[PDB]
Write an enzyme that holds these catalytic residues in place. Structure first.
Site, PDB file in Angstrom:
ATOM      1  CD1 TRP A 130     122.530  65.188  -2.351  1.00  0.00           C
ATOM      2  CD2 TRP A 130     120.855  64.740  -1.207  1.00  0.00           C
ATOM      3  NE1 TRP A 130     121.463  65.200  -3.395  1.00  0.00           N
ATOM      4  CE2 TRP A 130     120.360  64.841  -2.564  1.00  0.00           C
ATOM      5  CE3 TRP A 130     119.800  64.729  -0.249  1.00  0.00           C
ATOM      6  CZ2 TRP A 130     119.022  65.028  -2.723  1.00  0.00           C
ATOM      7  CZ3 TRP A 130     118.526  64.513  -0.529  1.00  0.00           C
ATOM      8  CH2 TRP A 130     118.025  64.659  -2.113  1.00  0.00           C
ATOM      9  CG  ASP A 211     124.644  66.876   8.253  1.00  0.00           C
ATOM     10  OD1 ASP A 211     124.760  67.392   6.955  1.00  0.00           O
ATOM     11  OD2 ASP A 211     123.793  67.031   8.868  1.00  0.00           O
ATOM     12  CE  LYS A 246     116.724  63.333   6.210  1.00  0.00           C
ATOM     13  NZ  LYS A 246     117.877  63.998   6.134  1.00  0.00           N
TER      14      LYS A 246
HETATM   15  C1  LIG Z   1     117.997  65.372   5.517  1.00  0.00           C
HETATM   16  C2  LIG Z   1     119.514  65.923   5.916  1.00  0.00           C
HETATM   17  C3  LIG Z   1     119.687  67.016   6.565  1.00  0.00           C
HETATM   18  C4  LIG Z   1     118.358  67.909   6.788  1.00  0.00           C
HETATM   19  O1  LIG Z   1     117.681  67.572   7.803  1.00  0.00           O
HETATM   20  P1  LIG Z   1     116.170  68.294   8.084  1.00  0.00           P
HETATM   21  O2  LIG Z   1     115.717  67.827   9.286  1.00  0.00           O
HETATM   22  O3  LIG Z   1     115.195  67.746   6.681  1.00  0.00           O
HETATM   23  O4  LIG Z   1     116.332  69.760   7.445  1.00  0.00           O
HETATM   24  C5  LIG Z   1     120.877  67.637   6.423  1.00  0.00           C
HETATM   25  N1  LIG Z   1     122.159  66.999   6.197  1.00  0.00           N
HETATM   26  C6  LIG Z   1     121.861  65.640   5.492  1.00  0.00           C
HETATM   27  C7  LIG Z   1     123.088  64.964   5.268  1.00  0.00           C
HETATM   28  C8  LIG Z   1     120.649  65.084   5.384  1.00  0.00           C
HETATM   29  O5  LIG Z   1     120.401  63.910   4.883  1.00  0.00           O
END
Ligand SMILES: *Cc1c(COP(=O)(O)O)cnc(C)c1O
Ligand SMILES: *Cc1c(COP(=O)(O)O)cnc(C)c1O
Lengths: 396, 396
Positions: A130, A211, A246
Site C-alpha cells: 500500500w 515498515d 493505528k
Molecule cells: C499507515 C501506514 C504507513 C503510514 O503511517 P502514517 O503514520 O499514517 O504516515 C506506512 N506504511 C504502511 C504499510 C501503513 O499501513
C-alpha cells in the site's frame, strides 16, 4: 510559472469518500476506509491518550523546540517495543531513533538519508503493497522495483515466487518488508519463512527496511516484532520506519520513528548525524504532542496497562468481524470459500471481488470498496454485516 | 553501507548550548539562543494557547487524519492574516494554503513543488540570511545564489548593492524575501523600497518567495504584512511560507503554512494539486495539534484578544531590551555607537563584535554569542544587562 502545470490525479481513497458522502441511500457501507472504526463506526481517541493529554496540559511549561531527533524517552520506548527489553542491539548501543511526522515521514527521511549518503539506487517493494511507497522513494531519486508476494488463486504468500523474484536484486539494494499485517493482503511470513528470508538477506547483501505500522494488530506486541527480531539478530545493519497512527489511534498527530542499526555505536552515531542533516533540510525537528502522549503512556505502568487492553480490544474486534463475515456469507449462501479471510491479519484483505462486481456493489447496493476488491474489515459492524453479505451474494 | 559515512558537522547554535551548559560560572549569559525568552529567561506557553488546548481536550472526538492541506479554518485564518480581511486575492480565490510542519516544512514543500513542477533552477537568498535556507533548497535540487543586503559599516540595508546584485537573476528565478524582522540583521525595507522592489520584480520576471516567521514582532500584525501586500497587489504569482513558532510560542508543535498565489482560481487549484502530491510524498498530512490551537485562537474574539495582547507584550519587551542595551552601554562608557540597535526590528542584530571579541567574551566573562557577533536581544533581562554591558566594554 504555474500556467501549464498539469493537475495531479485524485488519490483513490479520497475519491471514494466523496462518492460515499454524495450517496443518499440509507444503508450505504464504506469499506474503503484505511482507518480503524469501532462498533459505532467511529474512530475514537483512546482513553489512555485522553488521560495522557490531560497530564501534558497540566505539566507542560514550554513549547520550545525538541532536538532534531525528538524526545529521548520516545526513542527509548520504541527501541524496546521493536527489539525487546533486553536486546543486545540496545545494550551495545547499535541503534538510534529519530522521532518523525508519522510512518510516511520516517520512510521519507530514510529515503533522503540513503540517497544522499550511500550508493543505494533501488528499493524493492512487494507486489502489492500500500500505496505511496513509490512516490516517497522516487522523490528522493531512488528507483522502486517490485517482488512477487501474493498468490491470487490460493490467497496465500507465494514464497517461491517471492525469493525467485528477489534474487534479481543486487548486493547493496534495499528491500522493504512489512513487519506484520501486510497491507493490503493480510498475509504475513511465518517465523520460519522470516528466518530463511533473514539468512538469504545477509548472504545476498540486501539492506532491510522494515515498515512497521501495525504492531499489536496481528497477535500481540512481542509476537508481531518476532520477524524483525529474526532479521536484527542476523544483520549488522537495518532501518525500521514505525508508526503509532493505528495502534495508538493518533493518526493526525503524526507520530512515527526511524531507527537506524549498524555494526557498532561508532558507526551508528556517524550515520545518524547525517540522518539528522536530512531532517533539518526537511522539517527541522518533530511535532511534540503525539510523541509526548506515546512516551507518557509507555513509561507509565497504569497508563500502559489501559492502552494495551485498548489495543487488544481493537485486535479482537477485527478478528470477530473477519469470522462474522465468513459465517454470514456462509449463511446467506453462494459459493463461498472466503475461509482465507479467517486466516489473514489486520484490517485489510482482498475479498476476491472483480472490478465490475465492486462497481455494481456500489451502484446497486451502496456498498463502497476499492476497485481491487480490497476491503477494510473494521468498516463491518454486527449491525451492517447481513446487508453487506446480502449484497455480496447478489453480485457473485 | 554506513561504514564509510562521514559525520555531519555540529550545527552552531547547538554547539554553543553544550558549551553553555558545561560552564560553571555564576553570571553566564547566553545570547545565541534563536528563541524568545521573557524577563525570567523562560520560553513560556502562552495563556491563550493553554486555554485553546483545554478546549481541544474537552472537545476532540477523533484523531483521524486531516486532509493533505490540513484544516480549512487554519487556511482561512492565515490567508486573512497575510493578505488582509477584504483582500482581492481571497475573494477571487487566487490563493490556496497547505498547513505544514513549521516554516521550514513550508519552505521544503515549496522547494519540492518548484523543482518537480516548474523550470526554476536557482533561488536567490540574502547575504546574510538565517541559516539552513541553503540545505532545504539544495536537497530539492535547486541552486541557491546570494544577493547583497547588509552594509557592515553603516549597519544598514545597502539597497543599491541589493538591486545591483539582484539584476544578475534571470526571469524565472525565485527570490526569497524575509517579510519583516530580517534574520539576522533586523533591517527591513521601507514600504517605498518594498514597492520599488515589487515593481522591479514584475518587470524582471522574478517569482517571489516570502519567508514570514515574525509577523507581529516589528510594529504590529497588519503593518508587518505591508511589504508582502505591496508584492501581492503587483504579482500574479507568489509563494509565502509562514511560521507560527515564534508569534504563538508554538515552536515544537510544528505549525506553519505554505500559500500559493497565481492569476486565477483555475490555475491555483491545478498548481495546488501538485503541491499536495509533494506533501504525500513527504509526510502525507500535517500534525493537527499546534494548528488546531492557532485556528481556535484566531477564530474566537475572546481568545484572539488575549493572544494579540500577549504578542504586543513580547514585541514591547524586545523593544525595551534594545533601548536598555544602548543606554547601559552608553552609561558603562566606551565608544559607542550602538544607536543602530534601537533602529532594528525583531530579536536579532549584529552587535558589531569581532570573532575574537566574542571568543574572549565567552572565555573571560561567560557571555555566549555566535562568532558573527549576532545577538538575540530576548536573552537580555533588566537584571543581566549591566554585567553584559560591563563585559562588552571590557573587550572593546
Ligand atoms: C499507515 C501506514 C504507513 C503510514 O503511517 P502514517 O503514520 O499514517 O504516515 C506506512 N506504511 C504502511 C504499510 C501503513 O499501513
Ligand atoms: C524560525 C524561522 C523559520 C522556521 O520556522 P519553524 O516554524 O521553526 O520551522 C524560517 N525562516 C526564518 C527566517 C525563521 O526565523
Amino acid at each position: 510559472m504555474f500556467e501549464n502545470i498539469t493537475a495531479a490525479p485524485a488519490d483513490p481513497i479520497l475519491g471514494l469518500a466523496d462518492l460515499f458522502r454524495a450517496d443518499e441511500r440509507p444503508g450505504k457501507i464504506n469499506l474503503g476506509i484505511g482507518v480503524y472504526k469501532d462498533e459505532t463506526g467511529k474512530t475514537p481517541v483512546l482513553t489512555s491518550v485522553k488521560k495522557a493529554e490531560q497530564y501534558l496540559l497540566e505539566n507542560e511549561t514550554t513549547k520550545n523546540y525538541l532536538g532534531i531527533d525528538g524526545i529521548p524517552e520516545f526513542g527509548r520506548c520504541t527501541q524496546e517495543l521493536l527489539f525487546g527489553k533486553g536486546s543486545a542491539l540496545i545494550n551495545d548501543k547499535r541503534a538510534r531513533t529519530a522521532q518523525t511526522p508519522g510512518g510516511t515521514g520516517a520512510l521519507r527521511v530514510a529515503a533522503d538519508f540513503l540517497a544522499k549518503n550511500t550508493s543505494v539506487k533501488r528499493v524493492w517493494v512487494s507486489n502489492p503493497s500500500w500505496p505511496n511507497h513509490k512516490s516517497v522513494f522516487n522523490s528522493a531519486g531512488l528507483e522502486v522495483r517490485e517482488y512477487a508476494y501474493y498468490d491470487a488463486e490460493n490467497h496465500t504468500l507465494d514464497f517461491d515466487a517471492l525469493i525467485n523474484s528477489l534474487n534479481e536484486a543486487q548486493a547493496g539494494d534495499v528491500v522493504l518488508f512489512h513487519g506484520c499485517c501486510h497491507a493490503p493482503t493480510g498475509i504475513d511470513p511465518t517465523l520460519e519463512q522470516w528466518q530463511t528470508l533473514a539468512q538469504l538477506s545477509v548472504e545476498k547483501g540486501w539492506l532491510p527496511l522494515f515498515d512497521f505500522a501495525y504492531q499489536g494488530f496481528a497477535r500481540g506486541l512481542e509476537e508481531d516484532a518476532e520477524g524483525l527480531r529474526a532479521f536484527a539478530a542476523m544483520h549488522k545493519e537495518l532501518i525500521v520506519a514505525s508508526s503509532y497512527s493505528k495502534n495508538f489511534g493518533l493518526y493526525n498527530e503524526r507520530v512515527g520513528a526511524c531507527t537506524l542499526v549498524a555494526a557498532d555505536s561508532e558507526t551508528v552515531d556517524r550515520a545518524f548525524s547525517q540522518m539528522k542533516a536530512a531532517i533539518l533540510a526537511n522539517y527541522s525537528n518533530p511535532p511534540a504532542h503525539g510523541a509526548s502522549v506515546v512516551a507518557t503512556i509507555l513509561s507509565n505502568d497504569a497508563l500502559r496497562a489501559i492502552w494495551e487492553q485498548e489495543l487488544t480490544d481493537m485486535r479482537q474486534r477485527i478478528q470477530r468481524m473477519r469470522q462474522l463475515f465468513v459465517n454470514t456469507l456462509q449463511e446467506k449462501g453462494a459459493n463461498r470459500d472466503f475461509s482465507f479471510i479467517i486466516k489473514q491479519n489486520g484490517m485489510f484483505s482482498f475479498s476476491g471481488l472483480t472490478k465490475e462486481q465492486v462497481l455494481r456493489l456500489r451502484e446497486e447496493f451502496g456498498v463502497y470498496a476499492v476497485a481491487s476488491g480490497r476491503v477494510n474489515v473494521a468498516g463491518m459492524t454486527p449491525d451492517n454485516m447481513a446487508p453487506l453479505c446480502e449484497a455480496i451474494v447478489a453480485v457473485l
